[PDB]
Amino acid sequence: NELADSMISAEKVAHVQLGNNLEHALLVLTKCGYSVIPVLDFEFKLHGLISAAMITDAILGLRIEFERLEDLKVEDVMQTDFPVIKDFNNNERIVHLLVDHPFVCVVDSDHHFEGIVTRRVVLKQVNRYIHLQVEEN
Amino acid sequence: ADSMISAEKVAHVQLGNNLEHALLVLTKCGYSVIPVLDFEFKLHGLISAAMITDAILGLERIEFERLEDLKVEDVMQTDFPVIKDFNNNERIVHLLVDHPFVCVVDSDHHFEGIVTRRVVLKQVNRYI
Ligand SMILES: [Cl-]
């Protein structure tokens, strides 16, 4: 159960809500310690992922138009194309997703946001394996 | 060893550049953290949008007008691990447990590239 036990619980992951403006999202991103955060609805279902780069790209003028952050909404710029994990029954699919994704969101069958799995657990396992090889030799 | 992303494929900023320029480079480049170099391409620090925005967080507002007043060296992180070569492979994997990437430099602090967690994930996927 090592992949499942490594999930970071949702209440430890900052998020924004549909309808939040981009100035609010930038504040959450800056304080939270994650470079990408989930976008949830009022039922805590997962709709998207947002980063500072997505926000700033949206206000790149012909001048960075920081005044526009007040008016744009997170759903206007968030990424809607993302993988999810719905169970821990398949270790290989999770490891496969972590190749091109630094973390993957965990949701239940109705898309309620549960937490994230990151690459760190796999690095911990590789680290342990390397040390076991030293021990065995 | 063969997985290092070489320095010329990584965007950087230079000492003395302001935070407005750094935000532009960060936004376009596709890396969330980029190196800060000097004229000799020596590594002085690492900078991210979160470091930049934290520096201009007021008690009432995000003070974007201050981006042109601050320089990258004012906000960059200067305490980070590096590797000089691939003569200590166990240390590299050890570092990648708590760091998403580590910079590669030479003895003169010249920036050579970065090693990331992705290559390890690639190997694990292939073994599995
Ligand atoms: Cl990572």
Residue numbers in the entry:
A (entry chain A): 12 to 73, 75 to 149
B (entry chain B): 15 to 142
What does the publication say?
The facultative intracellular pathogen Listeria monocytogenes, like many related Firmicutes, uses the nucleotide second messenger cyclic di-AMP (c-di-AMP) to adapt to changes in nutrient availability, osmotic stress, and the presence of cell wall-acting antibiotics. cbpB encodes a 150-amino-acid protein that is conserved in some Firmicutes. We determined the structures of free CbpB and CbpB in complex with c-di-AMP at 1.6- and 2.4-Å resolution, respectively. These structures reveal that CbpB has tandem CBS domains (CBS1 and CBS2) that interact to form a disk-like head-to-head homodimer. However, here we found that CbpB is a direct activator of RelA and that c-di-AMP inhibits CbpB-dependent RelA activation.
The structure of free CbpB is similar to the c-di-AMP complex, with root mean square (RMS) distance of 0.86 Å between their equivalent Cα atoms. The major differences between the two structures are within the c-di-AMP binding site. Notably, the conformation of the Tyr45 side chain in free CbpB has severe clashes with the bound position of c-di-AMP, and therefore the binding site does not exist in free CbpB. While these structural differences exist, they do not provide obvious explanations for how CbpB-RelA interactions might be regulated. The CbpB structure exhibits very little change upon c-di-AMP binding and appears as a homodimer in both the free and nucleotide-bound forms, similar to the crystal structure of the CbpB homolog from B. subtilis, DarB (PDB1YAV). It remains unclear how such modest structural changes result in such large impacts on protein-protein interactions, and future work should compare these structural characteristics with those of a CbpB-RelA complex. The third category maps to the conserved surface of CbpB, which is far away from the c-di-AMP binding site and could be involved in another function.
